[PDB]
Design a protein around this ligand. Structure first.
Ligand SMILES: [Mg+2]
Length: 596
DNA sequence: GGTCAGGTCAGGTCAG
């Protein structure tokens, strides 16, 4: 029931020195050259595609066309998304068997199963081992993007920060062979790093941490006031306040690191025992008071607040903060608006000084990330009217809220979609299920919420541009799914794709009706079912034109007619925004090419 | 057969 090959490096095996007796012995030539390659110092930067060429004999493929086929896969590995797969079927389908010298002697009907396992063998024992030999994959947490870094480069940074963390007494090496709970990892961010712990999956102790986590969330919702609902807080405050809003979003740097463990331990003990048993209280207290971590064959103690990566760290930091909130922000104007996440505070009032004071009140208590601070206060050095917060972009003047998109310039957008599922594999002769699973709704739902489609505080200018931006995204996902159909399913019948295409602009457009209509408000003008299906079909237009040659046929019949009149009842929806591509998505790389 | 309540999964958003 296994159709898929996973691209990621840790699926790699460790190469025998000699090839097994069911494999043809041209392979042993390759393994020998593999060792010779590893003994090369390789101080200077070198491409993997180039290094493999001088390892795998041309004599193994015969023709250059066969070889480029196999390089299309190495490149995919070198450019992989987390979880990305290919079909095992590609490893052999459509090859020029004639040109393969060592198969003339093997019966034709026997050849494809020899080539798949020989290509599996080369991929598992030579290609990934070598990539691993020179680099480390780190996941950027922008979608599933994985960046590869040179081992000499990463190691240097690792040791560099490790020495800092050893200087700053955050990490202290002791001698008791106390059990470490996980392995520390140093993963670089924008300017800093992130020290995190990977918990050894514990021996049936996770259920215990699940239980404790729920039990303290019960104390959070109880002895501490609710922090709002965000959608309702921003609804009410924009109605209670009619003048120019003033606001600030501040980003605390290292919320975990700046927790005072002692206080947290006193909060723990302070719980009523009908709520939290004294034994459990004490388990958390020496759990977070004794955080031990394995580095390079050494076990250290973590004492800078809470360990990112520990299962308790989240909820325990929540408790800490909720208690702080009581201390410092309970008395604020009732009319003003305030909402917090884990380390992101958003505060709005119609008076400049109340926000300015809030900035001071917060700075007296916390060390913040000053570059991350955003404000419309006129005496700030870079004031703005739009504040990013919580995955949304609030405009304090207009009071219109958009979705926030995390797509750096040259981000390869295929990294924002997990199209492969290894627990539920799709056949190579069933591309229809591979293009529909791509099209499941749940993936854009977080942009199909009361927040984006309501017309309570939102114009129609903005309830439109929202739905339009969401659909640009579903398009890019469609394009990535297509090139997975093209490059892994290898389909040439593009007739069973239009089905789910229009079969989702209908449901995709209709959902915006029930969700958009249930949250009507005083800026609601008039929206229309085919106004939405037309926005949708013009979004696909503006996107698909980026690979016009593969797609003009589909855009030819689309553009031709379709009644793209684009009449809008409001009149202040420019509608120019809909023809073309919103600036965010034009500068995203849609092609796949391994840099090194 | 038609609801609910609970459980799982999936892909996505938050945020460490
Ligand atoms: Mg933050």
């Amino acid at each position: 029931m296994v159709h898929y090959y996973r691209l990621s490096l840790k699926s790699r095996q460790k190469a025998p020195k000699i090839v097994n007796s069911k494999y043809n012995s041209i392979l042993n030539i390759a393994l020998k050259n593999f060792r010779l390659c590893k003994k090369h110092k390789t101080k200077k930067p070198v491409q993997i595609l180039a290094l493999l060429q001088e390892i795998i004999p041309k004599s193994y493929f015969g023709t250059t066309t066969n070889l480029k086929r196999f390089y299309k896969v190495v490149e995919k590995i070198l450019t992989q998304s987390s979880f990305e797969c290919i079909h095992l079927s590609v490893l052999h389908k459509c090859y020029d068997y004639d040109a393969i010298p060592w198969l003339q002697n093997v019966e034709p009907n026997l050849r494809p199963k020899l080539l798949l396992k020989h290509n599996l063998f080369l991929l598992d024992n030579i290609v990934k081992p070598i990539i691993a030999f020179y680099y480390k994959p780190i996941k950027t947490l922008n979608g599933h993007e994985i960046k590869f870094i040179r081992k000499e480069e990463y190691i240097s940074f690792e040791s560099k920060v490790f020495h800092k963390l050893k200087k700053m007494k955050y990490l202290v090496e002791v001698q008791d062979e106390v059990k470490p709970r996980g392995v520390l990892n140093i993963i670089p961010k924008q300017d800093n790093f992130r020290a995190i712990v990977s918990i050894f999956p514990d021996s049936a102790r996770k259920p215990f941490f699940k239980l404790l986590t729920s039990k303290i969330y019960k104390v959070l919702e109880e002895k501490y006031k609710t922090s709002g609902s965000l959608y309702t807080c921003w609804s009410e405050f924009t109605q209670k306040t009619q003048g120019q809003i003033y606001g600030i979003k501040v980003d605390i740097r290292d919320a975990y690191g700046n927790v005072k463990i002692p206080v947290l331990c006193k909060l723990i003990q302070s719980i009523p025992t009908h709520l939290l048993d004294s034994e459990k209280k004490n388990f958390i207290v020496d759990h977070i008071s004794n955080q031990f971590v394995a580095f390079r064959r050494k076990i250290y103690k973590w004492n800078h607040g809470l360990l990112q990566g520990d299962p308790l760290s989240g909820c325990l930091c929540e408790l800490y903060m909720a208690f702080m909130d009581r201390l410092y922000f309970s008395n604020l104007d009732k009319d003003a608006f305030i909402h917090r996440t884990v380390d992101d505070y958003f505060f709005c009032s119609p008076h400049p000084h109340k926000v300015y004071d809030f900035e001071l009140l917060i700075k007296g208590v916390y060390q913040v990330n000053p570059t991350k601070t955003r404000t419309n206060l006129p005496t700030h050095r870079h004031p703005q009217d739009e504040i990013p917060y919580c995955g949304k972009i609030f405009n304090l003047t207009t009071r219109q809220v958009r979705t926030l998109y995390k797509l750096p310039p040259n981000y390869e957008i295929r990294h924002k979609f997990k199209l492969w599922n290894f627990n539920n594999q799709i056949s190579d002769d069933n591309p229809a299920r591979f293009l529909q699973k791509a099209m499941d709704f749940p993936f854009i739902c977080n942009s199909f919420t009361k927040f984006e489609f309501n017309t309570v505080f939102n114009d129609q200018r903005t309830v439109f541009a929202n739905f339009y931006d969401a659909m640009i995204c579903v398009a890019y996902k469609f394009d990535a799914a297509m090139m997975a159909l093209r490059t892994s399913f290898l389909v040439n019948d593009f007739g069973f794709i239009w089905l789910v295409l229009s079969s989702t602009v209908r449901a995709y457009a209709s959902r915006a009706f029930k969700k958009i209509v249930t949250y009507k408000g005083g800026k609601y003008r008039k929206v229309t079912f085919q106004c939405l299906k037309s926005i949708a079909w013009r979004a696909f237009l503006a996107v698909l034109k980026r690979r016009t040659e593969i797609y003009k046929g589909l855009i030819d019949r689309i553009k031709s007619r379709e009644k793209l009149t684009m009449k809008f009842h409001d009149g202040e929806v420019d509608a120019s925004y809909f023809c073309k591509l919103p600036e965010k998505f034009r500068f995203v790389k849609i092609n796949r090419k391994a840099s090194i």
